Amino acid sequence: AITSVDSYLLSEIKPRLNTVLENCYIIDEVLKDFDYQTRESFKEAFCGKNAQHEVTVGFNFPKFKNNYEAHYLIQLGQGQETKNSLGSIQSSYFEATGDTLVESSTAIREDDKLVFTVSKPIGELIKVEDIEFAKYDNLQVEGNKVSFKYQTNEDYENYNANIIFTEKKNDSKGLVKGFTVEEQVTVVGLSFNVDVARCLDAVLKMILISMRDSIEEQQTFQLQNLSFGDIAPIIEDGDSMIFGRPTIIKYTSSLDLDYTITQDINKLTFKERKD
Amino acid sequence: ASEAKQTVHTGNTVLLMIKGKPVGRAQSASGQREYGTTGVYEIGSIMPQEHVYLRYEGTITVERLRMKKENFADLGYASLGEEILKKDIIDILVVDNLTKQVIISYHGCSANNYNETWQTNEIVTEEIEFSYLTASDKART
Amino acid sequence: ASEAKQTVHTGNTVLLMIKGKPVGRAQSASGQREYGTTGVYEIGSIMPQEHVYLRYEGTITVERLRMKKENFADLGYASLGEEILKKDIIDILVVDNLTKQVIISYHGCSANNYNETWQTNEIVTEEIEFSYLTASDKART
Amino acid sequence: ASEAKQTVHTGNTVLLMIKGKPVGRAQSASGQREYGTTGVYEIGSIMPQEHVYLRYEGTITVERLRMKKENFADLGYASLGEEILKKDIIDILVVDNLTKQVIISYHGCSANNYNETWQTNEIVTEEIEFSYLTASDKART
Amino acid sequence: AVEPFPRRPITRPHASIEVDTSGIGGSAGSSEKVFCLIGQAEGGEPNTVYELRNYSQAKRLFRSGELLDAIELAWGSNPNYTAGRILAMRIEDAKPASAEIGGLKITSKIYGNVANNIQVGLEKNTLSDSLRLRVIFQDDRFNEVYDNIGNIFTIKYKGEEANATFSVEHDEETQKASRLVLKVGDQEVKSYDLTGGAYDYTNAIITDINQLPDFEAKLSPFGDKNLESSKLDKIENANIKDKAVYVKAVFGDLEKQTAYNGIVSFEQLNAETSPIKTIEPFELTKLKGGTNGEPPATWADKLDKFAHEGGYYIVPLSSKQSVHAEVASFVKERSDAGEPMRAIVGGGFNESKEQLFGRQASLSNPRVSLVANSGTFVMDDGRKNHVPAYMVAVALGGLASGLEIGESITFKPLRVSSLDQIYESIDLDELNENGIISIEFVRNRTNTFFRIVDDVTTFNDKSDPVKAEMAVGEANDFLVSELKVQLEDQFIGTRTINTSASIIKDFIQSYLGRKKRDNEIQDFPAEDVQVIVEGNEARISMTVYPIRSFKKISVSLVYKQQ
Amino acid sequence: DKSDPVKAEMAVGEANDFLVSELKVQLEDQFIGTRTINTSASIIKDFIQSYLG
């Protein structure tokens, strides 16, 4: 599962950034340090659902024009290998497993059990929110649903819960081969007005923090290391310069591959020496 | 994408908790356990015929940056004199940031030594080493 | 290494009992015996023709850390003053912890010496010496 | 670990008193007893039929660091010259520090040996040996 | 197997001591293996195998028979080599005894001719409008009594109204009576269906009725009665305003209490869709129809019952040649199936050596050994019994069960009081050379011993010790079986992702090395192992040297002067 | 009824009574009484197991 860090940044940034700019209360917390003049002018421009101006994000070397009033620019950056493992082995699995998901569900009333239903086959369960199923509950999984017994849990026919689970594909057990990669990626905000750039960079730092709690970040992209450059004129051949402070993001992740095993031993016969 | 079959723990996926309170600006922690295995040697063998467990010793260390508030001395967890004699045992829990499930818990922790460093060019740090009765990894899925 | 499979009695596997109770904070126990063996010599030759047994001496030692409750003095298994004359014999058993099977028993134990120590930073140590009538190892098979 | 909850008497928990005063700079204390136990033997069999008690011997030892004031010689609890004949019996108590409850008492203590040492870089050590009439452990319950 | 008897409930904390002529007898010792036996035996369920840990259980369940004597030989033959645990099944297909009187079909938990000596009867208790029960099992002198049977609680209506009526309805399809309605002055307050749900237990009904301000349901203190509601009896228009109206579950109260009787089971007679024959008092009457039946012509079905039980040693208490063939065929099947076993056999009194050779000629199998000697044994209570060889076979089986895997029964002493015939040195040699195991007599200055000369199976050839000496073959058997089952768990049972032939080879060598460190095996070739893998199958081949025991010593003396 | 010792033998029921009551009051102090910022089900499970041990 080769990880495209650049795609992950875009997937996380685009929704979360829109949400942050949507409300004003969060922005005030973010821009608490800045002076009144810069803070409100930025808020007057981009903040709120009724903002006429809008921010954009894209990758480098596009053949079209970007909104140079305010824009996030990304470029892939360097990559390095840091740590290996014996035989390049990472893990062994009895089931072909995909991504790890979080889903919300409501308990359903069966005869002997209360069951939750999920959009896909459960495979490996990880956690149901704030439930410590005892052995007498007899927690078990079946297809796309998870079940626990009804008795002495009868108040919970309407229980509303979140579920963390994995996507199951096949029963073909296999090994993992791969290593760890230390990758760096560059991000920069652009504007023809320096004050906007500083506000824009500060907004970015917050959502990077929020990404530390994300499922993908916690499981796949770990050990953030942020580095900020000096504010510089990106462009000078024009009616006015473009100013932007580049930032560098570092990640640790695994470049993994699945190796499938077919040599399943089932029979075992003992024969003594003829002598 | 995120395949959980290969994930590992790091500093960003762990919390250190005492009495429900998450200790702040905690830097590192190390855990040691010694079963005191010893071999049995007969007369007619250089090889050890078998090994046996004899003694369980375990210590855990914690490194922290002294916050102006809620330091280990202010929290009452540590002690600086005869106040120690009135301090009861504690349980130190390492809990997962993602799920809030437990990874390992130390029961009956007791303080062994206390170290604090005042330095000019660096942030203040303090270190504590505890001795615990038993460890546990229960309450899993 | 395992509990059941180890062929040798470690200190952990053993439990010590008196009068239907375990002895808490026990530390050591020793049992010594002398059959009063002697050699027979005669004028004919220097070499001893035979060996015989004369007198049976049996003593057992125990050490313990003085608990704030349930000590020998508190429990009545040992006495300080003239009350000793009102104390009957005692029987001690050394037991397998796993199954409460008996390993060896001391019958008719009576006290000989009682020693006690206090020190600045050490744990209070209580020692006692018992002389017994017989020692038997039965009910194992 | 805590003061009250520890089931074992550490040296810290214990306090030693003489004649309504504590003994400062105490370092060690030992008490030994012998009931004069003996075995009964007869012609019929080697094994001892019974055990009996003959004589009661009781001694207690104490060590102390010679203070510039309130020593045993200064305090009159011990004597050097012929003044000993003018010294009566003394009673010693070993006490629980928390509540001043009694742990064990020695009655009728009289002196046997008195030892003193001086050295270049060590602390002056004062030792004394007391023989007593009886030892009792009462008023606990 | 089934450990038949659980605890007896007790009533009071006490210590009781009673003189007796006999004690509790022997006890099963710690053992690696289990010993299976079949024989004539009174008591217990036919075609069922029972596990015994103590002689007390054997007496309590296998009440009498030569089988019970065999168990005594197993544990009493040698205190040092006391036999291990036991599996027992009675050959006789006994029957229960039955009595059908007073609306009740009464049958015996005991199977055999003894069962007809059971007497049970009901009596009418005029004092509380209730039935009474007594159970006496005269042979064991077991007397039981129950009183106030059926009456749970009483209802009184306290109001001034003219009439209060109590009614219970009946369902003819299933014969149940599952309704209970209180009516007063042609007006109804509540109705309780006794088919579960709202009023499953009488406890809720009592709570429900007590809540009614004009009624009180009060609990009878004579016996715990919290029966389910469905067990209440047919009741039609009982006047609640009267002094006392009883709510009755005659069978329900009987069903609970009589379950604890140690002798009897109760059934409610259906008339001969037929209504229920009323349960009524009747004379204490003998049960009838209980017999021992007859033994089967073939014991193969019995032996098949022991498959998948782990009993290495099996002994049939018989001399029939055909029966011996059945066991030999059965043991052959189990050994190939993966459950090794050994059979010990011996027939008749003082049988001729030629007849012994006749048995040898008919039967030559390493999985079986044939014992020739017959003798007498002194047993508990001082009685001494003169018995056939297959009882001696038990002593050999009980001995071999107690001995460790690596130690043979060869030359070990035996406690048997005497033997029918005293074989000479040449007589003994002929038997042993022809694969017959025998007993030898020797005399000390003032002592006498009976010894087992050597280990030999019916198989005659001396070429291969595993075939001839069961002790050697047994050592191989436990070695391989313990190895394979462990191997199955690690690779087949436990989820294994990958495996190679070499890995298996290392694991095997690790296992063998451990055995040597435990002295279970003396030596072996490390390089002789072979492993082959083919798709889902693996072949394993290896060799181990058998242990050799000490047999012959020859001595010569020379006298000289000076 | 002899079926349940806690119901029949007050000594057994008393042991259960003091066990639970002492546990809950301690639990109330740690989480309800004392200001707790966060708590999870598993944390409670560990604390209970610590108490029983």
Automatic annotation (TrEMBL), chain A:
InterPro entries, alphabetized: SP10_terminator
Source organism, top-level taxon: Viruses
Record-given protein name: Baseplate hub assembly protein
Species: Staphylococcus phage 812
TrEMBL record, chains B, C, D:
Superkingdom assignment: Viruses
Protein name as it appears in the record: Capsid protein
Protein source organism: Staphylococcus phage 812
Upper classification of the organism: Viruses, Duplodnaviria, Heunggongvirae, Uroviricota, Caudoviricetes
Automatic annotation (TrEMBL), chain F:
Protein known as: Major tail sheath protein
